[PDB]
Design a protein around this ligand. Structure first.
Ligand SMILES: [Cu+2]
Ligand code: NA
Length: 639
């Protein structure tokens, strides 16, 4: 079940207009207050008019709209369930503009929602583009429009939230498909639940930024229910999805062919582990006591070339365990892993103790000291995020989290960890004065300019409950060592939420929930457009364009020559991300040292060390004098 952030508006003086309506199933039948009566389009008489089918509402007066509900027909018939749709808002009548919400709803009889940012409007319009099973009809039992307590205009210069992407599933896990630019998302065996799973099935969904289309696919070929996994993009360009509900399995997502192919079983059955891509393109994983048993689960490595998993039992999980009250079940979860030089993997936390993991032979571990500063020793920070914003200088920003997985207060603790060579204890200092808001279950992404966008979460970690939410996102700016509050959103993004950087420089933030008949399932996502895409007038700024590239595929140490349409000041390489349960071990940023060839022609070198420039797919962004980035050019980095 689900959402809607506000209170229902009075349906007394409402004037409703439909494009098609039968006798006995009129347009006004969707606002009467009965769940047994319904609106239905032409069937039998006047033939069968195929969708788009429109439902326009006139609320007579200006209301602070933040959502809508659509209750399907409750008579047991499927004819009319809305699939693809769009929600529009207006103040006059024929100046709708862009949709405030768009996407696809699941094929069932449950109440569907479209939750979006507050915007004053008099007219609301629900366009039903398709029917859930491809039939010509559209039927709504009850349609309600929701309102917020008040409207506060978004502050100029602090970004913008919107539109909302309505989804058929709760996106508890996600990844960008680099070759196509689409967002791949997945839930479990069901769209809203995981408990009582027979295994072997994952419901996936995708969203295309260029088309706006949301499609779904049932994945059974890999015999893996991919809820609660380790996720990593290997050097061969495939997403390694490990364990979870089906603890011993591995699933490989290939972006170029848009398909899922079976991977070899892991040596140790895991759930909630973090996996990290290494310097040689291999994938390292450790811990994960959510599924497959609760015991000491040491490291293991995946080789893409041989298609094997090999145990590294001496890469001990013991030194990275948090002091979690629930014990080993939680203490080895969601490690802040980063692939580094010479096959090593840095573990930045969540435990106070940081460690170096080695992958040669049967593995090894060496203490990297405690995450600390002049303010003291940093406590365990489960569900705290870690972002490598400057891989060349080995800079990692860590923030938030709580001592225990649940029933624990989040903190404002933030640190900057500076990596040196493997085996050396990194320097750690506090980041500014920490976060503005204490948050756990929050998500983050590194932006083109080196800044880290932090969003969602709650002050006290209570899974599946939308209590003590943080609506105001923050951006950390390294050059200034300062956090900045951005414009707030209206949707709670707590446990099971995700954030990914899109190729267009915007942030995709979604999910939260996945508990079944609970009221906290968020079958959606929202787009955050940062300030760097806006001019001083509050309109979308002119973006510099990468007119030509010498090559799309490059080896570490190699050069790329580009041509632009205007002068460039800075450039960056951002590794494509993957996300689940606050973990994103794939994203990282490399600031590029540019050589000006003149005539808007620039050259740069991809770092020689594959521990910095992790093999895989990367986003090339160029920034002008005003700081406005281009859309990304997809670059494949090999060894
Ligand atoms: Cu979970
Ligand atoms: Na009705």
């Amino acid at each position: 079940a689900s959402a809607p952030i506000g209170s229902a508006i009075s349906r007394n003086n409402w004037a409703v207009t439909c494009d098609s309506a039968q006798s006995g199933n009129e347009c006004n039948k969707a606002i009467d207050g009965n769940k047994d009566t319904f609106w239905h389009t032409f069937y039998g008489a006047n033939g069968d008019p195929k969708p788009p089918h429109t439902y326009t509402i006139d609320m007579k007066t200006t209301q602070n709209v933040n959502g809508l509900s659509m209750l399907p027909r409750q008579d047991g018939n499927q004819n009319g369930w809305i699939g693809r749709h769009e929600v529009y808002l207006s103040s006059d009548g024929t100046n709708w503009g862009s949709p405030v919400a768009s996407g696809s709803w699941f094929a069932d009889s449950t109440t569907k929602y479209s939750n979006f940012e507050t915007r004053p409007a008099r007219y609301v319009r629900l366009v039903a583009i398709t029917e859930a099973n491809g039939q010509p009809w559209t039927s709504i039992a009850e349609i309600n429009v929701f309102q917020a307590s008040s409207y506060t205009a978004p502050q100029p210069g602090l970004g913008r939230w919107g539109p909302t992407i309505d989804l058929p599933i709760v996106p508890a896990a996600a990844a960008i498909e680099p070759t196509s630019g689409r967002v791949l998302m997945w839930s479990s065996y069901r769209n809203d639940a995981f408990g009582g799973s027979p295994g072997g099935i994952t419901l996936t969904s995708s969203w295309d930024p260029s088309t706006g289309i949301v499609s779904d696919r049932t994945v059974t070929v890999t015999k893996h229910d991919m809820f609660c996994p380790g996720i990593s993009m290997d050097g061969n360009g495939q997403i390694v999805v490990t364990g979870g509900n089906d603890a011993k399995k591995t699933s490989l997502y290939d972006s170029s062919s848009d398909s899922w192919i079976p991977g070899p079983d892991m040596q140790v059955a895991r759930g909630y582990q973090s996996s990290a891509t290494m310097s040689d393109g291999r994938v390292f994983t450790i811990g994960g006591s959510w599924s497959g048993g609760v015991f000491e689960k040491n490291g293991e490595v995946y080789s893409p070339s041989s298609k094997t998993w090999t145990s590294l039992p001496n890469a001990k999980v013991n030194p990275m365990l948090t002091a979690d009250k629930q014990g080993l079940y939680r203490s080895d979860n969601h490690a802040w892993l980063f692939g580094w030089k010479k096959g090593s993997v840095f573990q930045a936390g969540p435990s106070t103790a940081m460690n170096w993991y080695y992958t040669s032979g049967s593995g090894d571990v060496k203490s990297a000291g405690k995450r600390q500063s002049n303010r003291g020793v940093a406590p365990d920070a489960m569900s705290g995020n870690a972002v490598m914003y400057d891989a060349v200088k080995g800079k990692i920003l860590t923030f938030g989290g709580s001592p225990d997985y649940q029933d624990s207060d989040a903190t404002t603790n933030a640190h900057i960890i500076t990596l040196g060579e493997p085996g050396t204890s990194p320097n750690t200092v506090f980041a500014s004065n920490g976060l503005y808001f204490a948050r756990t279950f929050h998500t983050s992404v590194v932006l083109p300019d080196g800044s880290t966008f932090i969003t969602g979460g709650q002050r006290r970690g209570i899974p599946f409950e939308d209590s003590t939410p943080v609506f105001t996102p923050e951006i950390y700016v390294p050059e200034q060592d300062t956090f900045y509050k951005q414009n707030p959103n209206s949707i709670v993004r707590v446990y099971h939420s995700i954030s990914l950087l899109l190729p267009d420089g915007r942030v995709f933030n979604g999910g939260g929930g996945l508990c079944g008949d609970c009221t906290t399932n968020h079958f959606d996502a929202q787009i955050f457009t940062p300030n760097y895409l806006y001019n001083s007038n509050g309109n979308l700024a002119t973006r510099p364009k990468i007119t030509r590239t010498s090559t799309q595929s490059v080896k570490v140490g190699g050069r790329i020559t580009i041509s632009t349409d205007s002068s460039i000041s800075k450039a960056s390489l951002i590794r494509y991300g993957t996300a689940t349960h606050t973990v994103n071990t794939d994203q990282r940023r490399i600031p590029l040292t540019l050589t000006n060839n003149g005539g808007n022609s620039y050259s740069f070198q991809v770092p020689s060390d594959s521990g910095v420039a992790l093999p895989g797919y990367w986003m090339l962004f160029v920034m002008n004098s005003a700081g406005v980035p281009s859309v990304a050019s997809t670059i494949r980095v090999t060894q």
